[PDB]
C-alpha cells in the first residue's frame, strides 16, 4: 500500500446504515480507499460487522481509529490521527499512550499510518470533542503543515466536516509539504467541488455527501480520475 | 545532516554557567560525538549565543535543544525540538513547534531540525514542574510513551531523569521495543562506571551536570563509553 499513489477516498460512518448494494458500490468504483471513520460514539460491533462487509473487495480498507475500543483486526491499514490543534493532550498523545500500553502486541502485526489532523472548521462535531482552536488563519493552518512535516507524519489531513474549506488554505499547505501527503476533506458532495480541490490537495476524502445524495457523491471518483 | 544514530556519547552544557579556564576546550576535543546546548528554567538568548560561538570553532557538532522560542539563534550545526509526550500541557507537545513555524518560518527550512520525544521519568525535578508531566510511572507507561514515538516517526527518544540515575531496566525495555530511533538516555551520570552501565542499552548517553561538580571525572565518561 501507498497512500502517495492515492487521488480519492470514500470516509464511511460505523454509526450510519447504508444499503448493501450502495456500500458494494463505492468499494468497487475506483476509489483508492475506503476508510472506515467514526468520529464518536462509535461501537466496536459496528466496525467488525463494516470490516466484514468490505474485506472481500481488493480496494484497501481501513481502519480510522478515534477511540481504542473500536480498534478491530482484520483491516488493511490502520491510521491513527493526531489532532495538532487541540488544546488537550489527550487527542494529541494521551489516548495514544493508554492505547499502546494496552495493545501494544496487536500493535506490531499491522500497517499503522500516523495523520496529522488539522481541524479547521470551528463548528462541527469534532471540534467540539478534540477542544481544538478550529478558528485558524490561513498562517495558522500552514504553520500546522509545517509542524506535521517536522514531526514526519505519512499524512497532514487537513479537515473541514461537513463544510467546504478555503482553497487558498489548501493550496498553500500543500506547497509547504515536501514530504507528507495531504488529505483534504470537506463538503466534496459532487464532480464540481471534488475537481476544484483535487488540483491542491494529494487526496480528497468524500464521507458525508455518501448519506446526503449517493448518486451525486459517486461521480467524485471519476471526477479525480476519469 | 550529521547522524546521530552513529553516536554514543554526548555533553549538555548550561548556556547559564561558564566552564573555568580551557574546560569548554578539552571538553569539545574530548571524543565526544556532539556538544549541546540546553539549559534550564528560562535560558536566554545572550548565553545561547556567546555558548554558540564558543563551540561553533570546533570540529565536533554543536547542537541548540530548543526549550525556548526566545533562545532561538542561529550558527549551530542542529537544533532539538522536544515534545514532552508525557506533558498535560499541548504547548510544550506541539503548541510551541507551531509557534516557531508561525514565527521563524524562514529560519526552520535554513536549519536542520530534528525532533525529540522527550519522556520525563522523575517526577521530582524542575523540569517536570515545568512542563506539567505526568511523570510517575512504571516501566509500563514508560515503554507505551516510546511506542507513541515511533508510531509519531520522532528520530529520538529522550528518556530524562536529570538529577538522578534512572532505573536500568527501564532503559533495557525501552531500548527494546525501540526499532527504529535512538534512545537518549540522560540522568545522574558522573562517572565512568554508571557511564559504561547506561551505555550497555542507551545508544546514547548524556552527560550534563556533571561537569560543573567534578571536570575531571565526567570527562573519563567519553573513554569508559568508546
Ligand atoms: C485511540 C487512539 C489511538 C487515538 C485517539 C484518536 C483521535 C485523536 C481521534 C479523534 C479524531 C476525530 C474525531 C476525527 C474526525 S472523524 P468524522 O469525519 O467521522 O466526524 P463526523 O462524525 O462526520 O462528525
Ligand atoms: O463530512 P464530509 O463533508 O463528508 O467530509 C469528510 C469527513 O468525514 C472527513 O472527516
Not at 65 to 78: H, M, N, Q, R, T
Not at 147 to 172: C, H, N, R, T
Request: hydrophobic share 45%.
Amino acid at each position: 500500500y501507498d497512500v502517495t499513489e492515492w487521488k480519492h477516498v470514500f470516509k464511511l460512518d460505523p454509526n450510519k446504515d447504508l444499503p448493501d448494494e450502495q456500500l458494494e458500490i463505492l468499494c468497487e468504483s475506483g476509489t483508492d480507499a475506503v476508510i472506515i471513520g467514526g468520529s464518536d460514539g462509535v461501537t466496536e460491533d459496528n466496525v467488525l460487522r463494516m470490516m466484514s462487509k468490505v474485506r472481500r473487495f481488493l480496494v484497501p480498507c481501513v481502519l480510522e481509529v478515534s477511540a481504542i475500543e473500536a480498534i478491530v483486526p482484520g483491516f488493511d491499514l490502520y491510521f491513527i490521527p493526531s489532532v495538532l490543534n487541540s488544546k488537550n493532550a489527550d487527542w494529541i498523545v494521551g489516548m495514544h499512550q493508554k492505547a499502546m500500553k494496552e495493545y501494544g502486541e496487536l500493535m506490531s502485526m499491522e500497517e499503522i499510518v500516523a495523520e496529522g489532523y488539522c481541524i479547521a472548521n470551528p463548528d462541527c462535531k469534532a471540534a467540539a470533542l478534540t477542544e481544538a482552536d478550529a478558528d485558524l488563519n490561513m498562517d495558522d493552518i500552514v504553520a500546522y503543515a509545517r509542524v506535521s512535516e517536522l514531526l514526519q507524519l505519512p499524512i497532514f489531513y487537513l479537515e473541514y466536516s461537513g463544510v467546504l474549506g478555503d482553497i487558498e488554505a489548501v493550496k498553500k499547505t500543500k506547497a509547504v509539504l515536501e514530504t507528507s501527503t495531504l488529505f483534504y476533506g470537506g463538503g466534496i458532495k459532487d464532480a464540481e467541488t471534488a475537481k476544484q480541490y483535487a488540483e491542491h490537495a494529494d487526496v480528497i476524502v468524500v464521507g458525508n455527501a455518501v448519506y446526503e445524495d449517493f448518486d451525486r457523491a459517486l461521480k467524485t471518483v471519476a471526477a479525480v480520475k476519469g
